Amino acid sequence: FLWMLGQALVDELTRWLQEFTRHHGTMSDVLRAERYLLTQELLQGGEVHRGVLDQLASELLLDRRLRIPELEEAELFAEGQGRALRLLRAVYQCVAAHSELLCYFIIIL
Amino acid sequence: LWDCLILYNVTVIISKNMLSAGIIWDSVCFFFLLLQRRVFLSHYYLH
Amino acid sequence: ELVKGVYAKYWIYVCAGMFIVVSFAGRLVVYKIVYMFLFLLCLTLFQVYYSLWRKLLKAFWWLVVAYTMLVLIAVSELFSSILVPGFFLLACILQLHYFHRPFMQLTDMELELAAGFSDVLSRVQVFLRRLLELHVFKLVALYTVWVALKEVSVMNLLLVVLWAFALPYPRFRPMASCLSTVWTCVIIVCKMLYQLKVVNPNWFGVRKGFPNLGYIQNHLQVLLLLVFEAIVYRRQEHYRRQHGTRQQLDQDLLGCLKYFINFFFYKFGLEICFLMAVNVIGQRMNFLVTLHGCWLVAILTRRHRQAIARLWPNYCLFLALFLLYQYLLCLGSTNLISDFLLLLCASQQWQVFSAERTYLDMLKVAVFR
């Protein structure tokens, strides 16, 4: 069906976009996985710095930690909606990686 | 800084009251400014 | 047969319709009051007891006797009179004969899945109807429309001396409503005899009741609205007589929704009032709204919500007095409705400020980053 074809192509697109952002994605796993979070709810943060930078050369291993406070906490809903939402997630990652190129495009446009 | 921006918005609306263009957009701004001023929490925004 | 008891209870509204045909017929003055508006004042009687809702039977008993007397004395035209009020006296005398109880001495205070959802929804709405959401807001909205934006001058007693002081101080919010019923009943009584009898043109912004239908056509609408609110109130008053705060928040989307549906004005009310003042400013742009705007600056330069809370009784006072002045300026408008909205909102925030206060992570990502 036409619908089914589009679904497959969306997943193909996610893959292609992930291939483009690959390097930046891995640079955001050795840094931003232990950086940006915004999921902690309730009141304030008890162990302030231990709850972020020390949590869970280009491709590092488990030098820091493993996955103690759920590495896949982020990957839960992320992979939960592998269709639609993830297409836009991949789009953002691409433009975050290639923001220099985005600027150039806008100025000539 | 956010409160000073709120005051700027207020004064625009209040000076437009004493006319002698519209406050519609300035009221949208007021809403958003007030929203963000409020969301500067010491809890959720502290995160 | 549930309908047997339903129709034994159905006599008040049955009479109302017959008093509507008694209205604009027979005596333009007397008939209307005696039948329709004295039954509407008997409604007020049981409401003003605040304990005898639909239990007052003494006066409701003699309402029938008064109507029988009228028919016995008097009611094409001999025949008209007869037929017409017998038609309502028939129903009235039937209550006196039997089943006066279901409506007056019984309702007292002392299918499948889809249908299941339907009845739940009925009751949630009615819960909001028995909440301040309906008990007050909707009533005063229609009041302002049908007083300020409608017949001005002498309807100030039905608004700027009532709701302009009842909104800030909710102690007399229900008393105000009962008095309102009474006063608009009085207003229709007065306008019944129009004003064209030997006009020799004391001064209170005399607009004069020249039309018949159109002129009687709005005060009765708010009279009925009071009645409707009272109905839904006393319904759930006897449904209660007989018959998540920050925890649901972090659950999910349903939790967030629930929290705010129940606690919007609880927290947002202050920011609301600030934006309602801007609304008034924009839908006016006069010199009168410089006062509103000056107060806005004052309460916005108070920053900390605790300091705004001690400026709140004076803010609410200003708003109330301003509504009164605005009328006395229009008598001795749409701008009046805007100042009413601000009053209503800020009054509710005065009743919260020093009272009640004393996948969803992606959504939180947006607002909170």
The answer to whether the Cβ–Cβ distance between B14 and C303 falls below 8 Å is: no
CB-CB contact of C312 with C350 (8 Å)? yes
Q: At what angle do helices C77-97 and C58-73 cross, to 10 degrees?
A: 150
Distance CA A5, CA A22 (A): 25
Tell me the C-alpha distance between C120 and C241, whole Å: 19
Residue holding tokens 């959802």? C117
**Residue in chain B nearest A37 by alpha carbon:** B47
From chain C residues 280-299, the ones with a CB under 8 A of any chain B CB are 281-282, 284-287, 289-290, 293-294, 296-297
Residues 6+ apart with CB under 8 A from C264: none
8 A C-beta contact, residue C26 and residue C75 = yes
The Cα–Cα gap between C316 and C314 comes to 5
- SS in 3 state form for C94-113? HHHHCCCHHHHHHCCCCCCH
Residue of B nearest to A45 (CA): B47
Alpha carbon of C351: minimum distance to chain B alpha carbons (Å): 21
Residue C322's identity, in one-letter code, is F
Chain C from 237 to 276: CB within 8 A of any A CB: 250
d(CA A14, CA C61): 79
Residues C350, C341: Cα–Cα separation, whole Å = 14
Which approach determined this entry?
A: cryo-EM
Largest CA distance in chain C: 81
| Pair A38, C364: CB distance under 8 Å | yes
Distance between CA atoms of residues B25 and B13, nearest Å: 10
From CA B43, how far away is CA B37, in angstroms rounded? 14
Q: What is the rounded distance in angstroms from the CA atom of residue C293 to the CA atom of residue C342?
A: 12
Contact A55, A65 (CB under 8 A): yes
By the 8 A CB rule, do B45 and B39 touch?
yes
End-to-end CA distance of chain C: 62
User: C266 at the B interface (CB within 8 A)?
Assistant: no
Q: Measured between alpha carbons, how far is residue B36 from residues A30, C193, C303, C368, C369 in Å?
A: 31, 59, 14, 9, 10
Question: In this complex, do A38 and C359 lie within 8 Å of one another by their Cβ atoms?
Answer: no
Cβ atoms of residues C264 and C133 within 8 Å? no
Please give, rounded to a whole number of angstroms, the shortest distance from the CA of C353 to a CA of chain A.
Answer: 23
A68 dihedral zone (left: phi>0; alpha: psi -120 to 50; beta): alpha
Minimal-distance CA residue of chain B relative to C368:
B45
Closest CA to C327 of C144, C140, C136, C137: C144
d(CA C308, CA C353): 9
Preceding-residue numbers of gaps in chain A (C–N over 2.5 Å): 56
Q: Which residues of B touch A52 (CB under 8 A)?
A: none
C364:A38 CB<8 A: yes
Residues of A in contact with C365 (CB under 8 A): 38
Identify the residue among C259, C360, C361, C364 best suited for mutation to test binding to A, counting A beta carbons within 10 A and taking the highest: C361
Q: How far apart are CA C208 and CA C154, in angstroms?
A: 11
Length of chain B: 47
Please choose, from the candidates C267, C279, C268, C263, the residue with its C-alpha nearest in 3D space to the C-alpha of residue C342. Answer: C279
Q: Which chain A residue has its CA at the smallest distance from B47's CA? A: A38
DSSP string, C31-90: HIIIIIIHHHHHHHHHHHTTS-TTT--HHHHHHHHHHHHHHHH---HHHHHHHHHHHHHH
Other beta carbons within 10 angstroms of residue A54's beta carbon come to: 11
DSSP, collapsed to helix, strand or coil, labels residue A45 as: coil
CA B20 to chain centre: 24
**How many residues belong to chain A?**
109
Amino acid at site C155: M
Q: Number of C-alpha atoms within 13 angstroms, CB side, residue A88? A: 4
Q: Is C361 in Cβ contact with A39 (below 8 Å)?
A: yes
Interchain contact B24–A (C-beta under 8 A): no
C253 backbone dihedrals φ, ψ, rounded to 5°: -70, -40
